Write an enzyme that holds these catalytic residues in place. Structure first.
Site, PDB file in Angstrom:
ATOM      1  CD  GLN A   1      -3.122  -1.311   1.971  1.00  0.00           C
ATOM      2  OE1 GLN A   1      -4.192  -1.655   1.444  1.00  0.00           O
ATOM      3  NE2 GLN A   1      -3.025  -0.998   3.268  1.00  0.00           N
TER       4      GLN A   1
ATOM      5  N   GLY B   1       5.665  -9.242   5.884  1.00  0.00           N
ATOM      6  CA  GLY B   1       6.584  -8.120   5.875  1.00  0.00           C
ATOM      7  C   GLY B   1       7.846  -8.357   6.672  1.00  0.00           C
TER       8      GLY B   1
ATOM      9  CD  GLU C   1      26.197  11.155  -3.686  1.00  0.00           C
ATOM     10  OE1 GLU C   1      26.208  10.711  -4.867  1.00  0.00           O
ATOM     11  OE2 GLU C   1      26.193  12.378  -3.366  1.00  0.00           O
TER      12      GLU C   1
HETATM   13  N1  LIG Z   1       1.969   2.791   7.571  1.00  0.00           N
HETATM   14  C1  LIG Z   1       1.303   1.708   7.269  1.00  0.00           C
HETATM   15  N2  LIG Z   1       1.352   0.637   8.139  1.00  0.00           N
HETATM   16  C2  LIG Z   1       0.672  -0.467   7.852  1.00  0.00           C
HETATM   17  C3  LIG Z   1      -0.085  -0.547   6.658  1.00  0.00           C
HETATM   18  N3  LIG Z   1      -0.653  -1.780   6.647  1.00  0.00           N
HETATM   19  C4  LIG Z   1      -0.289  -2.471   7.754  1.00  0.00           C
HETATM   20  N4  LIG Z   1       0.524  -1.665   8.511  1.00  0.00           N
HETATM   21  C5  LIG Z   1       1.232  -1.988   9.752  1.00  0.00           C
HETATM   22  O1  LIG Z   1       1.944  -3.159   9.575  1.00  0.00           O
HETATM   23  C6  LIG Z   1       1.853  -4.022  10.696  1.00  0.00           C
HETATM   24  C7  LIG Z   1       1.213  -5.301  10.163  1.00  0.00           C
HETATM   25  O2  LIG Z   1       1.957  -5.699   9.021  1.00  0.00           O
HETATM   26  P1  LIG Z   1       1.310  -6.096   7.606  1.00  0.00           P
HETATM   27  O3  LIG Z   1       1.960  -5.405   6.429  1.00  0.00           O
HETATM   28  O4  LIG Z   1      -0.183  -5.808   7.629  1.00  0.00           O
HETATM   29  O5  LIG Z   1       1.579  -7.686   7.533  1.00  0.00           O
HETATM   30  P2  LIG Z   1       1.998  -8.531   6.220  1.00  0.00           P
HETATM   31  O6  LIG Z   1       3.370  -8.190   5.690  1.00  0.00           O
HETATM   32  O7  LIG Z   1       0.914  -8.406   5.153  1.00  0.00           O
HETATM   33  O8  LIG Z   1       2.111 -10.023   6.831  1.00  0.00           O
HETATM   34  P3  LIG Z   1       0.842 -11.002   7.073  1.00  0.00           P
HETATM   35  O9  LIG Z   1      -0.488 -10.381   6.662  1.00  0.00           O
HETATM   36  O10 LIG Z   1       0.924 -11.331   8.548  1.00  0.00           O
HETATM   37  O11 LIG Z   1       1.017 -12.229   6.212  1.00  0.00           O
HETATM   38  C8  LIG Z   1       1.008  -3.261  11.689  1.00  0.00           C
HETATM   39  O12 LIG Z   1       1.867  -2.567  12.557  1.00  0.00           O
HETATM   40  C9  LIG Z   1       0.200  -2.304  10.832  1.00  0.00           C
HETATM   41  O13 LIG Z   1      -0.107  -1.099  11.479  1.00  0.00           O
HETATM   42  C10 LIG Z   1      -0.128   0.522   5.782  1.00  0.00           C
HETATM   43  O14 LIG Z   1      -0.799   0.466   4.710  1.00  0.00           O
HETATM   44  N5  LIG Z   1       0.574   1.672   6.095  1.00  0.00           N
END
Ligand SMILES: Nc1nc2c(ncn2[C@@H]2O[C@H](COP(=O)(O)OP(=O)(O)OP(=O)(O)O)[C@@H](O)[C@H]2O)c(=O)[nH]1
Ligand SMILES: Nc1ncnc2c1ncn2[C@@H]1O[C@H](COP(=O)(O)OP(=O)(O)CP(=O)(O)O)[C@@H](O)[C@H]1O
Ligand SMILES: Nc1nc2c(ncn2[C@@H]2O[C@H](COP(=O)(O)OP(=O)(O)O)[C@@H](O)[C@H]2O)c(=O)[nH]1
Ligand SMILES: COc1cc(OC)c(/C=C2/C(=O)Nc3ccccc32)c(OC)c1
Ligand SMILES: [Ca+2]
Ligand SMILES: [Ca+2]
Ligand SMILES: [Ca+2]
Ligand SMILES: [Mg+2]
Ligand SMILES: [Mg+2]
Ligand SMILES: [Mg+2]
Lengths: 352, 54, 439, 430
Positions: free
Chosen positions: C15, C146, C254
């Protein structure tokens, strides 16, 4: 119900503060490790300021100022005074002071120390000095190499400071003293001096030709209660409060406490704190600080006030505990956390 | 306070200002790590299926 | 000209990638269908925007991007969204079952079965590069994908492209928006396994972005859309020098050379000013001095910490807008006399400045107002260690009871990887404190 | 992580399950013929989680109906939504199980279980990505208790890597068919401890007290009890059935709720508490939802939360309201009662919101607590057990079907262990 924790059991002052807080009926004590507190009454060492101010829906406040040790360690205080322009090398109320590391390490000011020393040998002047660390390891001598000996005899950094050899002496007694002022700095950086200070007295006539016997040279309550024969003769605790000292100045010297000493004390306090203000202010931070400080002063025969050290975790004198602590809650804690003066605000804006 | 290595272009400029001078593992070790954890998985699952057989 | 590939992993990574790529298009004048009228070199070329976009014979400008989620909902909304046509299907990679907030499930169980496919789709982009620099990797510390899959990816990127640089944009876990109780576990595990594979990482603590959205955007309860459009503004000022003519931070090497003299201490704090509400009817536009000064207020940082109680090792100022060197030096001169800015003894005290004259671009209908000048300051301060201290404490609290550990061990992980990771972190906190504090 | 397979076993399992499908069929706008007449596609975006799509674009509940006797399932086929269910999925013997765990688990039930697993297999083979299974049953009778746990064992065998979720009704002498209920329940709790990821402990004791003390019903029926049960089931499955921030599934719920594998017995809570037919019209404000949903009088398991500590808490708020206000109140309970949440799990209260309220209300909140106070329930079951087992009373009904006293002693022991672990963490401090 505001909430608080207690991470310094040894603290006289905040033991009392915690008791008054619980007796408000609107403050709950949690366990030492509970993060969901409004107020941390924290430890002295390694206080985790990094973890404060990250609890959503909790305004958090702590009773220490991150960075304040610069004022309350003698080495740091000497460094801050000689390095900060607003204080200066050209500073009328601090004793000439040098920081000396021990031999082992081999930046240190030793060779700059003896350079001014020898012009005091050259000038026929009084060149007795004090060495101290941050009744322990205090040595007063007019021989440099005596102390430079002693300071490396102990493996910690010390400061060599000028010893104030003509101090003001209360009669009857012909005897020394220092003044302890209690200062509270709130979350807005208001500087609050407490109306009640104390004179830690000596009970032994000051003697200029024997510097090693230190009950006539060091006004510490501990040393006083130990090696001094005359403990409690003139004053109850070797402590004289402000009513009596003011009266004695009026009767013997024809001045008052405010004019002869307290103006200088207020000038020193607000200069020292307004100096470090930008390094410690929690104005726009995500957690907030107050802190109680103990400033320690010496008055010489000319009625000149010298700062000797700032104490970061000070104990109060036993008569005053109630009042001061009530004050701490009133203006340090209740201002941030409202429920259902004994201080002088230090402020001044001279235009120039 | 000296302003050095200044470059300019149609889109912007860059420069430095100085206020005071100065006082991995293999593909196969990775496939081994992954496969060690997969066999730990299969062992735990076989212990489960053994207990269910009992 | 040297191409960089952007890889976005998991929900947060994908996202945020959406946010950035939308922003980039708007900036380079690329429309949603891939056409760029401004580009008179139909078919290709080596302009500096080409570092991030390749070209087709029809004049399409395609991101050098890979999106990777272990589950389809989010990358499906990319596949069907406003920028449907921007990307090649082959760059949007989807699993069936996600990692259930489990580092070990994303790294070991589900990682193993998809790592090769992602690497092949990545090499299809690298094979379109005359001189590839390396990778910008977007992900969260707390997700299962992630955190776990990103670190597996980072290991294999080290082996398949060993001479290339790797940069992380990492979202640090904030309970106000956090999805999961085990995010401290995942955060540590992935920091430990990614530390030596990453050349420079920019941490974004979701708590900082959230409170910036509340305090300065008048948003009552921020969504990921608010958070992500602000994060992409920051990311765009950080990457603008790879995409625009200039001479500061022109390639990924850099970034390390300017911001990271100690390889382990590679987490530069980002401060950004000004964030101004678009609904604000009347706004006095801020000056060069005012926004450079805002760079030293914690309330403008991507991670809240106190740089006054640390030391600096590098500081870059990136200005976009109406800025000239004279005003920057006037502002720096003023600021230095009112602020605690202590460098480490073995580094010059000073600033590297870059200025792009085009003011920041804001998405139509966004929450951010247009401004005449803005700055992003990248400072490698030891104060950011505070964030680690936070995470480690939470980790210590749970791991002392081995709470939730069984979810990891049951994916084939071993309890020992927990304490290995935690000891690497203990080492990191100690490195920071030695560099930045004195006895 | 889409499809769920629902199994309802025995008298109680089937009555509560039928109510479940009535309630959620109404929420998803699907009528007793299986056709759809709703106004928000928020109603169809994840309808596949609980329904298969059939010819005519009809929606058929992914539901298997199991009993050792035909009484209740006949009455389900007769009831309001009976004809929505796929007829093949009615699997029933004629024996009955006589309120006897042994007949459900070892003799009568063994004869029927493979047929049940055939319908299960055919429902899963069609699933694009099965997340697991949810069973409704009681633990006091024999079919739902005994066969239900037999089924759970065989499902873990065939699908060891899919989530197993139950709604299991505990027995109470206040609402009591037979004296052997503490025997059946102990025997099942053992199974549940080893063999499920997440169990909703719905205490018939608590349902009676809510009906009596709070809803002012002087003579509660199983219908007044099942109204509360079907409200709780709607609430705890909202996150699964509607689009949201969270994109919720059974596995992430397990990972974030269950810090220790055996401690997966959740205490559910609903607000506002509601009598059937009573149209009450006052808006509930978010501070009221929060205070009530955490009130012990609103819990469906007859435990005192202040006798324990919350390991984890998950909450859903339903209706058009301020998510700012929701965050404020949830923070306020945690910060004002921080004693009652373990400090060694940071940020252990997670909260979700859904725009669509349940039928009848404008605003509502459902609560899932993994509390150590749940031990109080198992202790109660244990005492009632020992009271009889000390004299081996009623044991013949079970030994006649092949069972040994030792099995009972094993089950008693495992439950007392469960109680001890809960107490371990109720005294642990970081
Ligand atoms: N800034 C921001 N944080 C996000 C977003 N989506 C999820 N998070 C944060 O990311 C963490 C959760 O990680 P995710 O990216 O949703 O997990 P993933 O990588 O999809 O892993 P799984 O769904 O567990 O398979 C939490 O702390 C959320 O607040 C987003 O679109 N923007
Ligand atoms: N330059 C100086 N000249 C004259 N007397 C001095 C002096 N420095 C210190 N003294 C005297 O020695 C005493 C102890 O000195 P010091 O300032 O180090 O106290 P301390 O740090 O040990 C305990 P506290 O924090 O309560 O003051 C002082 O109270 C003062 O009487
Ligand atoms: N809440 C509730 N409890 C029930 C219902 N029916 C039976 N019970 C309880 O279930 C237990 C008996 O189980 P039952 O389902 O009748 O036996 P089974 O069909 O052999 O599994 C007793 O504890 C009853 O109080 C019901 O509709 N609602
Ligand atoms: C209170 O009812 C519920 C509340 C829920 O998140 C708040 C969920 C799903 C959850 C999910 O998908 N991830 C989580 C992490 C922590 C707590 C709950 C979840 C849920 O799944 C059944 C039921
Ligand atoms: Ca071109
Ligand atoms: Ca490398
Ligand atoms: Ca038979
Ligand atoms: Mg995901
Ligand atoms: Mg019955
Ligand atoms: Mg068969």
């Amino acid at each position: 119900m505001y909430t608080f924790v207690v991470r310094d059991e040894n603290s006289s002052v905040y033991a009392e503060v915690s008791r008054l807080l619980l007796a408000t009926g609107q403050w709950k004590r949690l366990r030492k490790d509970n993060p969901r507190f409004n107020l941390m009454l924290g430890e002295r060492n390694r206080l985790p300021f990094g973890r404060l101010g990250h609890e959503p829906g909790l305004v958090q406040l702590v009773n220490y100022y991150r960075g304040a040790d610069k004022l309350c360690r003698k080495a740091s205080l000497v460094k801050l005074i000689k390095t900060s322009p607003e204080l200066s090398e050209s500073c009328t109320w601090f004793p000439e002071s040098y920081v000396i590391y021990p031999t082992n390490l081999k930046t240190d000011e030793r060779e700059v120390f003896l350079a001014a020393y020898n012009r005091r040998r050259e000038g026929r002047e009084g060149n007795v000095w004090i060495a101290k660390s941050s009744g322990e390891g205090i040595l007063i001598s007019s021989e440099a190499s005596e102390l430079l000996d002693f300071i490396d005899e102990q493996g910690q950094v010390h400061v060599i400071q000028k010893y104030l050899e003509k101090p003001l002496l209360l009669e009857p007694g012909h005897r020394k003293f220092d003044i302890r002022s209690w200062v509270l700095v709130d979350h807005l950086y208001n500087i609050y001096l407490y109306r009640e200070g104390v004179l830690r007295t000596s009970s032994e006539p000051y003697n200029s030709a024997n510097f090693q016997d230190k009950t006539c040279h060091l006004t510490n309550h501990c040393i006083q209660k130990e090696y001094s024969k005359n403990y409690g003769r003139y004053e109850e605790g070797n402590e004289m409060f402000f009513e009596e000292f003011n009266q004695y100045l009026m009767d013997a010297l024809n001045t008052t406490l405010e004019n002869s000493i307290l103006l200088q004390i207020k000038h020193i306090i607000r200069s020292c704190l307004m100096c470090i203000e930008p390094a410690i202010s929690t104005k726009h931070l995500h957690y907030q600080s107050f802190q109680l400080f103990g400033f320690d002063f010496m008055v010489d025969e000319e009625l000149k006030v010298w700062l000797i050290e700032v104490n970061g975790a000070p104990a109060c004198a036993q008569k005053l505990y109630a009042e001061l602590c009530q004050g701490i809650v009133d203006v340090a804690i209740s201002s941030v956390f409202p429920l259902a003066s004994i201080f002088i605000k230090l402020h001044h804006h001279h235009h120039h | 306070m000296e302003v050095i290595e200044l470059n300019k272009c149609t889109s912007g400029q860059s420069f430095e200002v100085i206020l005071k001078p100065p006082s991995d593992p293999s593909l196969e070790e990775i496939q081994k790590k992954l496969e060690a954890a997969e066999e730990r998985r299969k062992y735990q699952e076989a212990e489960l299926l053994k207990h269910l057989a009992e | 000209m040297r191409e960089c590939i952007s890889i976005h992993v998991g929900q947060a990574g994908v996202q945020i990638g959406n946010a950035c790529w939308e922003l980039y298009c708007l900036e380079h004048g690329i429309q949603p269908d891939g056409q760029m009228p401004s580009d008179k070199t139909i078919g290709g070329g080596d302009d500096s925007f080409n570092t991030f976009f390749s070209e087709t014979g029809a004049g399409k400008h395609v991101p050098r991007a890979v999106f990777v989620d272990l589950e389809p909902t989010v990358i499906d909304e990319v596949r069907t969204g406003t920028y449907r046509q921007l990307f090649h299907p082959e760059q949007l990679i989807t699993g069936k079952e996600d990692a259930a907030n489990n580092y070990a499930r994303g790294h070991y169980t589900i990682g193993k079965e998809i790592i090769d496919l992602v690497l092949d789709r990545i090499r299809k982009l690298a094979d379109q590069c005359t001189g590839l620099q390396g990778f910008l990797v977007f992900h969260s510390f707390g997700g299962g994908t992630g955190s776990g899959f990103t670190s597996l990816l980072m290991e294999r990127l080290s082996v398949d492209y060993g001479k290339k640089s790797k940069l992380e944009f990492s979202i640090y876990p904030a309970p106000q928006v956090s999805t999961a109780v085990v995010e401290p576990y995942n955060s540590i595990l992935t920091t430990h396994t990614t530390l030596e594979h990453s050349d420079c990482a920019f941490m974004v603590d979701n708590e900082a972005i959230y409170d910036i959205c509340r305090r300065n955007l008048d948003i009552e309860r921020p969504t990921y859309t608010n958070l992500n459009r602000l994060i992409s503004q920051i990311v765009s000022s950080i990457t603008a020098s790879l995409r625009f003519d200039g001479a500061l931070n022109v390639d990924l090497t850099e970034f390390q050379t300017n911001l990271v003299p100690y390889p382990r201490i590679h987490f530069p704090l980002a401060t950004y000013a000004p964030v101004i509400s678009a609904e604000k009817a009347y706004h006095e536009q801020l000056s060069v001095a005012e926004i450079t000064n805002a760079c030293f207020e914690p309330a403008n940082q991507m991670v809240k910490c106190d740089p006054r109680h640390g030391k600096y090792m590098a500081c870059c100022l990136l200005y976009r807008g109406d800025v000239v060197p004279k005003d920057v030096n006037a502002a720096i001169a003023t600021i230095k006399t009112k602020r605690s800015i202590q460098f480490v003894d073995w580094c010059p005290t000073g600033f590297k400045v870059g200025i792009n004259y085009q003011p920041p671009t804001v998405v139509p209908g966004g929450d951010l107002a247009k401004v005449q000048r803005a700055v992003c300051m990248l400072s490698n301060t030891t104060a950011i260690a505070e964030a680690w201290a936070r995470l480690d404490h939470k980790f210590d609290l749970m791991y002392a009871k081995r709470a939730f550990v069984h979810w990891y061990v049951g994916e084939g992980m071993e309890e020992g990887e927990f304490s290995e990771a935690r000891e690497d972190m203990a080492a990191l906190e100690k490195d920071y404190e030695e560099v930045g504090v004195d006895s | 992580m889409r499809e769920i397979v629902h199994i309802q076993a025995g008298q109680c399992g089937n009555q509560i399950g039928a109510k479940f499908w009535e309630v959620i069929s109404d929420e998803h706008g699907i009528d007793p013929t299986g056709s759809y007449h709703g106004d928000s596609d928020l109603q169809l975006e994840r309808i596949n989680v609980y329904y298969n799509e059939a010819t005519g674009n009809k929606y058929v509940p992914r539901a298997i109906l199991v009993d050792l006797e035909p009484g209740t399932m006949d009455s389900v086929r007769s009831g309001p939504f009976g004809q929505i269910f796929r007829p093949d999925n009615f699997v029933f013997g004629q024996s009955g199980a006589g309120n006897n765990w042994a007949k459900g688990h070892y003799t009568e039930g063994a004869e029927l279980v493979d047929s049940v697993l055939d319908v299960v297999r055919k429902e899963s083979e069609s699933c694009d990505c099965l997340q697991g299974f949810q069973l409704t049953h009681s633990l006091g009778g024999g079919t739902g208790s005994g066969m239900g746990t037999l089924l759970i064992s065989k499902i873990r065998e065939e699908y060891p890597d899919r989530i197993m979720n139950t709604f299991s009704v505990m027995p109470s002498p206040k609402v009591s068919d037979t004296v052997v209920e503490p025997y059946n329940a102990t025997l099942s709790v053992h199974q549940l401890v080893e063999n499920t990821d997440e169990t909703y402990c719905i205490d018939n004791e608590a349902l009676y007290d809510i009906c009596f003390r709070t809803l002012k019903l002087t003579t509660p029926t199983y219908g007044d009890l099942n109204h509360l049960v079907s409200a709780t089931m709607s609430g705890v499955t909202t996150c699964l059935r509607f689009p949201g921030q969270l994109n919720a599934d059974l596995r992430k719920l397990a990972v974030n709720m269950v810090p220790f594998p055996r401690l997966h017995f959740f205490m559910p809570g609903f607000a506002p508490l509601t009598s059937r037919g009573s149209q009450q019209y006052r808006a509930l404000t978010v501070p009221e939802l929060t205070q009530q949903m955490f009130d012990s009088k609103n819990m469906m398991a007859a435990c005192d939360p202040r006798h324990g500590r919350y390991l984890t808490v998950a909450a859903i708020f339903r209706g058009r309201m301020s998510m700012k206000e929701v965050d404020e109140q949830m923070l306020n309970v945690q910060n004002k009662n921080s004693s009652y949440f373990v400090e060694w799990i940071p940020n252990n209260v997670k909260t979700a919101v859904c725009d669509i309220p349940p039928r009848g209300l404008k605003m509502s909140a459902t609560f899932i607590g993994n509390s150590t106070a749940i031990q109080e329930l198992f202790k109660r079951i244990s005492e009632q057990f020992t009271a009889m087992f000390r004299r081996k009373a009623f044991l013949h009904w079970y030994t006649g079907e092949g069972m040994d006293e030792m099995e009972f002693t094993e089950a008693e022991s495992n439950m007392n262990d469960l109680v001890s672990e809960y107490q371990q963490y109720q005294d642990a401090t970081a």
